[PDB]
A and B are shown apart, each in its own frame.
Chain A
Amino acid sequence: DVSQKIKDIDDQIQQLLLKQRHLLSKMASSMKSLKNCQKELISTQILQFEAQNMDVSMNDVIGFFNEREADLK
């Protein structure tokens, strides 16, 4: 009857081989979601860089503006 254990364990192997194929599908899906986060991160960062670059520029000009006044008098 020991001829049966070789079949159940041989089937379990098959169920596990299937599960691998399913998880491999999830993995690819997961990758796609990762690429989206990566894309969204770089986008938000470029906006931040712009706004922040405009900010330090504003600081400069304001600094110069206040000079034409504090010296004008």
Chain B
Amino acid sequence: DNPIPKSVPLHPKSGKYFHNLHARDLSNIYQQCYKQIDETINQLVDSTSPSTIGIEEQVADITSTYKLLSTYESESNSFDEHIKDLKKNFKQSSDACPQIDLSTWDKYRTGELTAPKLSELYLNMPTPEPATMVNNTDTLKILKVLPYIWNDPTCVIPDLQNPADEDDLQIEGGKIELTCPITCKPYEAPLISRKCNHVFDRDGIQNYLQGYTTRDCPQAACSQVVSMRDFVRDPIMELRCKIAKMKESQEQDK
């Protein structure tokens, strides 16, 4: 009866096999999926036939697969975390078990000694969802805003730190300017600050901070001490200007 034990510890010769256990990396593929996603909004924005429909449909579809892909990714990241933990726990538990020998073998078979069984520990992993954070991915904000800026490149968008939040935007009144506050000319290389949401054209702060270490933010000298590193590229503002330039272009030739 029970000729073979329920489990035995990790054998020294199985060290390399255990070590190599891991879920196949998909980082490179996910990366390309997101890049493929991006390149699609670009051509969408850059080649969609004259507005008066906005693009609310197109955006809905794209955001639907974007979120899907993102849901998949989080599960994958979670999967690795669980595999790694479960393995680390197995190894430590396995290392406290006596090696197999003429006496030990009967004990593992009878139950006196019990070794950890990785296959069972694997089947019985957490399995929660999402278990991560609703990361504010740059590409998600563009999707959220896009339909609004398409029909009105100046519409005042209010605060959004948690996009993907199926809800309408608190579109304020008036309209923002597609012109750099340090050139008074329409943008051409918008840059947004990280510690404050002020956007200046590249040559704006490029020359404003030129020769200085950390000058206060130009806008009303906004307290925030800034530097070139604090200025990212503004996809949203570039989208606005991109759209305005297309509207002006479509106003003359349509």
Residues of A within 8 A of B (CB): 10-11, 13-14, 17, 20-21, 24-25, 27-28, 31-32, 34-35, 38-39, 41-43, 45-47, 49-50, 52-54, 56-58, 60-61, 64-65, 68
Contacts and interface: CB of A to CB of B under 8 A. Distances in A.
Given A41-B24, A46-B122, A54 B4 contact: yes
Q: How large is the interface on B (under 10, 10 to 19, 20 to 34, 35 or more residues)?
A: 35 or more
A38 B23 contact: yes
9 contacts: A11-B49, A13-B49, A20-B44, A21-B61, A28-B72, A46-B118, A49-B14, A61-B102, A64-B101
Given A57-B11, A65-B102, A28 B118 contact: no
A13 B46 CA distance: 11
A24 B83 contact: no
A61 B103 CA distance: 9
Given A27-B33, A50-B118, A35 B102 contact: no
A65 to B, nearest CB: 7
A52 B17 contact: yes
B229 interface: no
Nearest to B8: A57
A28 B11 contact: no
Contacts of A39: 23, 79
A45 B118 CA distance: 11
B37 interface: yes
A60 B65 CA distance: 53
A34 B122 CA distance: 20
B13 interface: yes
B36 A61 contact: no
Interface in B45-65: 47-49, 58, 61-62, 65
Interface string B139-170: 00000000000000000000000000000000
